[PDB]
Structure 1
Amino acid sequence: KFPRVKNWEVGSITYDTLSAQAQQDGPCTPRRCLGSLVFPEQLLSQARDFINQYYSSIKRSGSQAHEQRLQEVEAEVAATGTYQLRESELVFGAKQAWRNAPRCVGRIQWGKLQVFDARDCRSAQEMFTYICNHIKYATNRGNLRSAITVFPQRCPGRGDFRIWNSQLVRYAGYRQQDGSVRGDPANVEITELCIQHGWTPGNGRFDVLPLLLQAPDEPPELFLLPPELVLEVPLEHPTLEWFAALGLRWYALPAVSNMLLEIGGLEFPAAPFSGWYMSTEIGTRNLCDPHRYNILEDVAVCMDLDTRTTSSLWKDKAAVEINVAVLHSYQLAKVTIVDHHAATASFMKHLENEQKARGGCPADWAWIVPPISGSLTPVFHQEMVNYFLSPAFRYQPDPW
Structure 2
Amino acid sequence: FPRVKNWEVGSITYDTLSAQAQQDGPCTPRRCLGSLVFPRKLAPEQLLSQARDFINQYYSSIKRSGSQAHEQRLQEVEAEVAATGTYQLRESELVFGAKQAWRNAPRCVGRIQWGKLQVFDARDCRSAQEMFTYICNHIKYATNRGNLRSAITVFPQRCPGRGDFRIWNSQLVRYAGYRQQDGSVRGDPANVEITELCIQHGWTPGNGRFDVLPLLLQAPDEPPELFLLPPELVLEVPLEHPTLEWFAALGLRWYALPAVSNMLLEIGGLEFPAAPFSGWYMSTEIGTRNLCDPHRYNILEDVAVCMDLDTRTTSSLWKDKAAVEINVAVLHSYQLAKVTIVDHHAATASFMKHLENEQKARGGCPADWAWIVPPISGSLTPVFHQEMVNYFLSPAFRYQPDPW
Per-residue CA distance 1:26-72 (angstroms, 9 max, x = gap): 00000100000000931000000100000011000111100001110
**Distance in structure 1 (CA, Å) of the matches to 2:12 and 2:71:** 39
Contact 1:19 1:362 in 2 (8 A): yes
SS at match of 2:390: coil
- C-alpha deviation, 1:342, in angstroms: 0.1
**Distance in structure 2 (CA, Å) of the matches to 1:126 and 1:229:** 16
Contact 1:259 1:270 in 2 (8 A): yes
**Distance in structure 1 (CA, Å) of the matches to 2:352 and 2:45:** 40
- C-alpha deviation, 1:123, in angstroms: 1.0
5+ residue gaps, structure 2, are 39-43
Contact 1:81 1:156 in 2 (8 A): no
Matched residue, 1:229: 233
Larger displacement relative to structure 2 (75-84 or 295-304): 75-84
Q: Are 1:213 and 2:207 counterparts?
A: no
Q: Which consecutive segments of 4 or more residues in structure 1 shift more than 2 A?
A: none
**Distance in structure 2 (CA, Å) of the matches to 1:177 and 1:252:** 32
- C-alpha deviation, 1:175, in angstroms: 1.4
Matched residue, 1:17: 16
**Distance in structure 2 (CA, Å) of the matches to 1:41 and 1:159:** 23
Q: Are 1:132 and 2:142 counterparts?
A: no
Matched residue, 2:176: 172
Per-residue CA distance 1:63-92 (angstroms, 9 max, x = gap): 110000111011111111100000000000
Per-residue CA distance 1:116-175 (angstroms, 9 max, x = gap): 000000111010000000000000000000000000000110100000000000000001
**Distance in structure 1 (CA, Å) of the matches to 2:182 and 2:169:** 26
- C-alpha deviation, 1:310, in angstroms: 0.4
Mapping of residues 89-168 of structure 1, within 5 Å: 89-168=93-172
**Distance in structure 1 (CA, Å) of the matches to 2:47 and 2:187:** 44
Per-residue CA distance 1:356-377 (angstroms, 9 max, x = gap): 0110000000000000000000
Matched residue, 1:70: 74
**Distance in structure 1 (CA, Å) of the matches to 2:45 and 2:243:** 63
- C-alpha deviation, 1:248, in angstroms: 0.1
**Distance in structure 2 (CA, Å) of the matches to 1:72 and 1:345:** 43
**Distance in structure 2 (CA, Å) of the matches to 1:352 and 1:390:** 21
Matched residue, 2:41: none
TM-score (normalizing by structure 2): 0.98
Per-residue CA distance 1:94-125 (angstroms, 9 max, x = gap): 00000000000000000000000000001110
SS at match of 1:250: strand
**Distance in structure 1 (CA, Å) of the matches to 2:389 and 2:46:** 28
SS at match of 1:138: helix
SS at match of 2:245: coil
- C-alpha deviation, 1:179, in angstroms: 1.1
**Distance in structure 2 (CA, Å) of the matches to 1:290 and 1:250:** 17
Contact 1:236 1:329 in 2 (8 A): yes
State the identity as a percent. 100
5+ residue gaps, structure 1, are none
**Distance in structure 2 (CA, Å) of the matches to 1:41 and 1:189:** 39
SS at match of 1:338: coil
- C-alpha deviation, 1:390, in angstroms: 0.2
Contact 1:60 1:66 in 2 (8 A): yes
Matched residue, 1:198: 202
SS at match of 1:347: helix
SS at match of 2:284: helix
**Distance in structure 2 (CA, Å) of the matches to 1:111 and 1:103:** 17
Mapping of residues 314-353 of structure 1, within 5 Å: 314-353=318-357
SS at match of 2:102: helix
Per-residue CA distance 1:244-268 (angstroms, 9 max, x = gap): 0000000000000000000000000
SS at match of 1:116: strand
SS at match of 1:367: helix
SS at match of 1:25: coil
SS at match of 2:391: coil
Contact 1:41 1:81 in 2 (8 A): no
Match of 2:309 among 288, 305, 309: 305
SS at match of 1:243: helix
SS at match of 1:149: strand
**Distance in structure 2 (CA, Å) of the matches to 1:397 and 1:56:** 33
**Distance in structure 1 (CA, Å) of the matches to 2:2 and 2:29:** 15
Match of 2:245 among 241, 246, 254: 241
SS at match of 2:120: strand
**Distance in structure 2 (CA, Å) of the matches to 1:285 and 1:176:** 23
Would you say how many aligned residue pairs link Structure 1 and Structure 2?
Answer: 399
**Distance in structure 1 (CA, Å) of the matches to 2:128 and 2:213:** 17
- C-alpha deviation, 1:381, in angstroms: 0.3
**Distance in structure 1 (CA, Å) of the matches to 2:235 and 2:9:** 41
**Distance in structure 2 (CA, Å) of the matches to 1:69 and 1:265:** 16
Per-residue CA distance 1:263-305 (angstroms, 9 max, x = gap): 0000000000000000000000000000000000000000000
Matched residue, 2:27: 28
SS at match of 1:198: coil
- C-alpha deviation, 1:204, in angstroms: 0.5
- C-alpha deviation, 1:12, in angstroms: 0.3
**Distance in structure 2 (CA, Å) of the matches to 1:120 and 1:188:** 33
SS at match of 1:115: strand
**Distance in structure 2 (CA, Å) of the matches to 1:230 and 1:69:** 42
SS at match of 1:229: coil
Match of 1:278 among 277, 282, 289: 282
**Distance in structure 1 (CA, Å) of the matches to 2:22 and 2:204:** 46
SS at match of 1:227: coil
TM-score (normalizing by structure 1): 0.99
SS at match of 1:182: strand
